[PDB]
Design an enzyme around this catalytic site. Structure first.
Site, PDB file in Angstrom:
ATOM      1  N   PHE A   1       0.829  -1.149  -0.018  1.00 29.72           N
ATOM      2  CA  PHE A   1       0.160   0.066  -0.013  1.00 29.72           C
ATOM      3  C   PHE A   1       0.890   1.220  -0.110  1.00 29.72           C
ATOM      4  O   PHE A   1       1.909   1.120   0.346  1.00 29.72           O
ATOM      5  CB  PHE A   1      -0.910   0.080   1.118  1.00 29.72           C
ATOM      6  CG  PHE A   1      -0.389   0.098   2.529  1.00 29.72           C
ATOM      7  CD1 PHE A   1       0.379   1.383   2.983  1.00 29.72           C
ATOM      8  CD2 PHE A   1       0.406  -0.889   3.150  1.00 29.72           C
ATOM      9  CE1 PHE A   1       1.152   1.494   4.167  1.00 29.72           C
ATOM     10  CE2 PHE A   1       1.182  -0.934   4.186  1.00 29.72           C
ATOM     11  CZ  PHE A   1       1.558   0.325   4.780  1.00 29.72           C
TER      12      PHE A   1
ATOM     13  N   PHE B   1       2.800   3.150   0.844  1.00 32.78           N
ATOM     14  CA  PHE B   1       4.270   3.604   1.617  1.00 32.78           C
ATOM     15  C   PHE B   1       4.702   2.324   2.803  1.00 32.78           C
ATOM     16  O   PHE B   1       5.254   2.814   3.814  1.00 32.78           O
ATOM     17  CB  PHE B   1       4.629   5.198   2.046  1.00 32.78           C
ATOM     18  CG  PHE B   1       3.795   6.070   0.959  1.00 32.78           C
ATOM     19  CD1 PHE B   1       3.515   7.515   1.306  1.00 32.78           C
ATOM     20  CD2 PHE B   1       4.159   5.803  -0.318  1.00 32.78           C
ATOM     21  CE1 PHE B   1       3.168   8.658   0.401  1.00 32.78           C
ATOM     22  CE2 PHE B   1       3.696   6.718  -1.500  1.00 32.78           C
ATOM     23  CZ  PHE B   1       3.172   8.128  -1.199  1.00 32.78           C
TER      24      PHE B   1
HETATM   25 CU1  CUA Z   1       5.144   1.907  -3.376  1.00 28.62          CU
HETATM   26 CU2  CUA Z   1       7.437   2.946  -4.643  1.00 28.62          CU
END
Ligand code: CUA
Ligand code: HAS
Ligand code: HEM
Ligand SMILES: [Cu+]
EC number: 7.1.1.9
Lengths: 33, 557, 166
Positions: C84, C86
């Site tokens: 996702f 980050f």
């Molecule tokens: Cu998730 Cu680059």
């Protein structure tokens, strides 16, 4: 006059390059299973 | 409404001047952010020296997104549009349909300024790829999607000159340089379809509120259809400059109009169906449609391996002619003092580790080792940033007089070729750091300066990129300094502004017009073509246009 | 000279053009050999498998990150993974040595990369699809998931972790 020895040498280099390159990366890909 | 009789008797000697000069401006802007990105992968955070030096600039990525679009898309296509048009002209002597060859430049412009605005805003800061789902501005996918359409006009204008000449010379084969620009232009239509498809049928409506989501498997299957061939687009023009103008810059002759015609033929047949090489890591596409492109992909390499021999053999005849000693005496013999010669030869040089890495890249499974790492931006720098770029950068030092008239002062020349020797030196080193970093796994497109112990095993190559950034910086400034003097000096010696274009003669044989006459059924091929684009993207654009699963866009910046 | 040496510049051309197709075949050979052994376990699974992103961190295999691992065989374990914007889910993924791991990655959001530093595990993850790959970690350690595909400003920082245990 003859053999274009020069161009043969130029395409000789591309060949070692197009190999050492392919070939090492095959090693890398097998090291990585 | 003109002066220089020069343009009243050829006005496309200007529809070529502007296209070309919009082109190098576009280079200057981009290639700026580059020294800064080099230092990034050198692990060094120079982005604040940048941020305040052009505070219009937000993220590292706002840059890469500029660096990408402008250099890979803008500068290149604009160069394909100076050379791959104006050359077919002067070889047939005919005047390109000057209206259409002028809706082209104006088009290009607005497309460019349409997609510049949001781009210098942050409303399309979605990499050169503009991969779905990250959404961009509405003004991005129009601009870009206008810019690209420009070339279509161009396809006409050339196909146009092509048939006025076929018929004002009936039964004489096509000339050599037009025969390039024909199959080249005809190859670009059959490619572009993809991204025009994905613009008409996807980015645009959904960029315009006209749906709430894009499927990306197809938005990025359709994007590589264009996505490959395009580089060949980026590239074949300077093959042309290299096949038909380098020899005689060298004091030689192309040694086979046939072998060159065959290249360009083979490029038409093969640059369009290879896109899945880009999609090895994408899922949803089958292993065999995959494998079917990996071999086609190794095939398109057969043009470049050939172009190698033809050019080497060709530099060499020229080299001996001019006193060519023993096994490498031929090298030391050449015009090493004239950047129109040096720029592409240095280009072609590091085009060796270029294609080699390419052939890795395409060897289906090996791609998993290098895909999306420093390896790829190292690979293309050898190819576009360098052969293509230096071949155009260097093509100023003869195509620029021939389009303005300011000849090159022995000031300019000797600058012409320091610029060229740093860019090439710069690119080599950068190349080494990039390919190495990638082998260690530094991802690409990543502001690694700012997660600055993440990649600690990439120490010493990171040094190479530092070194690289400084060198290309000097090189790029040196470049700016010097492009600027040859379209700025108010000299105007118009006689060599009508020197016709240093075309080589063409070491001609018997087993030409059989074979030559074989590859001139432009038609039969331009369709053997289509059959191939269809057979390969056929099966998938269907197991795919049938499971249209679009999802909503995003905006993580 | 010149017409002596074009009856020689074309011969050599196929001296060469022959060789180049020879060499290029040794490649598609060696490529298929890989396509024979395990190693090509990594190839995204090809037969399609559509899912919804806005609701995947809601129902289905992807909403409870510790149900991620699921013995799907005698020797296999499946990990449902979530790349996702980050981060990755779970973190760490825990999985055995000697054991075939079928990864099945996917997105609540933008395209991502799932790059398993030290292996051949390298694979696009599109919001909409199930990137399915199989790999056999023969050697304990924590490995590093690397996102290697731009997803806006979080990206240089997007890492995950694998732990294959002894
Ligand atoms: Cu998730 Cu680059
Ligand atoms: C300008 C442009 C480019 C050219 C030209 C180019 C050529 C190839 N490439 Fe590439 N490329 C790939 C494969 C190839 C192959 C097989 C060729 C072939 O055309 C290469 C053939 C080259 C040769 C066979 C060598 C010929 C050597 C010559 C011709 C020199 C002779 C020397 C002379 C004449 C002088 C000697 C003179 C003396 C005086 C001594 C693959 C995969 O299989 C990927 C994706 C990998 C991944 O996983 O992302 C890829 C990725 C890219 C990307 C990234 C796209 C993105 O951002 O995602 C760009 C921009 C790019 C550009 C270019 N590429 N490439
Ligand atoms: C000194 C000059 C240049 C330097 C130092 C340079 C350096 C770099 C580096 C280090 C990257 C990696 C960005 C990343 O992965 O974070 C990159 C990206 C890129 N460059 Fe260059 N480059 C230069 C000139 C050029 C030129 C002339 C071209 C076009 C012919 C070009 C085309 C591209 C493209 C298409 C990308 C892709 C970035 C993306 O959207 O992922 N570059 N550059
Ligand atoms: Cu490609």
């Amino acid at each position: 006059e003859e053999k274009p020895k020069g161009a043969l040498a130029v395409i000789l280099v591309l060949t070692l390059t197009i190999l050492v390159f392919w070939l090492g990366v095959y090693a890398v890909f097998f090291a990585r299973g | 409404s003109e002066i220089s009789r020069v343009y009243e008797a050829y006005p496309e000697k200007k529809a070529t001047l502007y296209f070309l000069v919009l082109g190098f401006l576009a280079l200057i802007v981009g290639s700026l952010f580059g020294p800064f990105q080099a230092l990034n992968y050198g692990n060094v955070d120079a982005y604040p020296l940048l941020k305040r030096l052009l505070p219009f600039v937000q993220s590292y990525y706002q840059g890469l997104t500029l660096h990408g679009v402008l250099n890979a898309i803008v500068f290149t296509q604009l160069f394909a549009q100076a050379i791959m048009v104006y050359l077919p002209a002067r070889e047939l002597n005919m005047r390109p349909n000057m209206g259409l060859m002028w809706l082209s430049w104006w088009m290009a412009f607005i497309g460019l300024v349409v997609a510049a605005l949001p781009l210098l805003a942050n409303e399309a800061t979605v990499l050169y790829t503009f991969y779905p789902p990250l959404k961009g501005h509405w003004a991005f996918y129009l601009g870009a999607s206008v810019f690209v359409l420009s070339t279509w006009v161009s396809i006409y204008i050339v196909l146009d000159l092509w048939r006025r000449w076929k018929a004002a010379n009936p039964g004489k084969v096509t000339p050599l340089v037009t025969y390039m620009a024909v199959v080249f232009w005809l190859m670009w239509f059959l490619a572009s379809l993809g991204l025009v498809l994905e613009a008409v049928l996807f980015l645009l409506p959904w960029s315009f509120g006209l749906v709430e989501g894009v499927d990306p498997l197809v938005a990025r299957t359709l994007f590589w259809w264009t996505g490959h061939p395009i580089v060949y687009f980026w590239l074949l023009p300077a093959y042309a400059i290299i096949y038909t103008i380098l020899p005689k810059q060298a004091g030689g002759r192309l040694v086979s109009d046939p072998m060159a015609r065959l290249a360009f033929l083979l490029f038409l047949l093969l640059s369009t169906p290879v896109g899945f090489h880009h999609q090895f890591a994408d899922p949803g596409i089958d292993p065999t449609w995959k494998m079917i492109h990996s071999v086609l992909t190794l095939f398109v390499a057969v043009p470049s391996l050939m172009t190698a021999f033809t050019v080497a053999a060709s530099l060499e005849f020229a080299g001996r002619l001019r006193g060519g000693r023993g096994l490498f005496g031929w090298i030391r013999a050449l015009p090493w003092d004239n950047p129109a010669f040096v720029a592409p030869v240095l280009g072609l040089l590091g085009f060796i580790p270029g294609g080699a890495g390419g052939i890795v890249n395409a060897s289906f499974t090996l791609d998993y080792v290098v895909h999306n790492t420093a390896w790829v931006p190292g690979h293309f720098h050898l190819q576009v940033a360098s052969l293509v770029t230096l071949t155009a950068m260097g093509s100023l030092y003869w195509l620029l007089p021939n389009l303005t008239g300011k000849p090159i002062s022995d000031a300019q020349r000797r600058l012409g070729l320091a610029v060229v020797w740093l860019w090439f030196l710069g690119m080599m080193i950068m190349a080494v750091g990039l390919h190495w970093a990638g082998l260690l796994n530094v991802p690409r497109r990543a502001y690694i300066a700012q997660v600055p112990d993440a990649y600690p095993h990439a120490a010493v190559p990171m040094v190479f990129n530092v070194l690289a950034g400084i060198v290309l910086l000097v090189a790029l400034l040196l470049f700016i300094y010097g492009l600027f003097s040859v379209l700025l000096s108010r000299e105007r010696k118009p006689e060599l502004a009508e020197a016709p274009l240093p075309f080589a003669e063409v070491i001609s044989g018997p087993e030409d017009r059989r074979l030559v006459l074989a590859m001139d059924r432009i038609g039969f091929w331009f369709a053997v073509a289509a059959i191939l684009v269809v057979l390969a993207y056929g099966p998938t654009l269907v197991q795919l246009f049938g499971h249209l699963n679009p999802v909503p866009g995003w905006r993580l910046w | 000279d010149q017409h002596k040496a074009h009856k020689a510049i074309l011969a050599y051309e196929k001296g060469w053009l022959a060789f180049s197709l020879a060499m290029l075949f040794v490649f598609i050979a060696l490529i298929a050999y890989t396509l024979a052994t395990h190693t090509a376990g990594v190839i995204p699974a090809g037969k399609l498998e559509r899912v919804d992103p806005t609701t995947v961190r809601q129902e289905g295999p992807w909403a409870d990150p510790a149900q991620a691992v699921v013995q799907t065989g005698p020797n296999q374990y499946t990990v449902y993974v979530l790349a996702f914007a980050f981060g990755y889910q779970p973190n760490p993924i825990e999985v055995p040595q000697g054991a075939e791991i079928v990864f099945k990655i996917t997105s609540p959001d933008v395209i991502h990369g799932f790059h398993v530093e030290g292996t051949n595990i390298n694979v696009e993850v599109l919001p909409g699809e199930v990137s399915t790959v199989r790999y056999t970690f023969k050697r304990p350690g924590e490995y590093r998931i690397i996102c290697n595909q731009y997803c806006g400003l979080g990206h240089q920082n997007m890492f995950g972790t694998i732990v294959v245990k002894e």
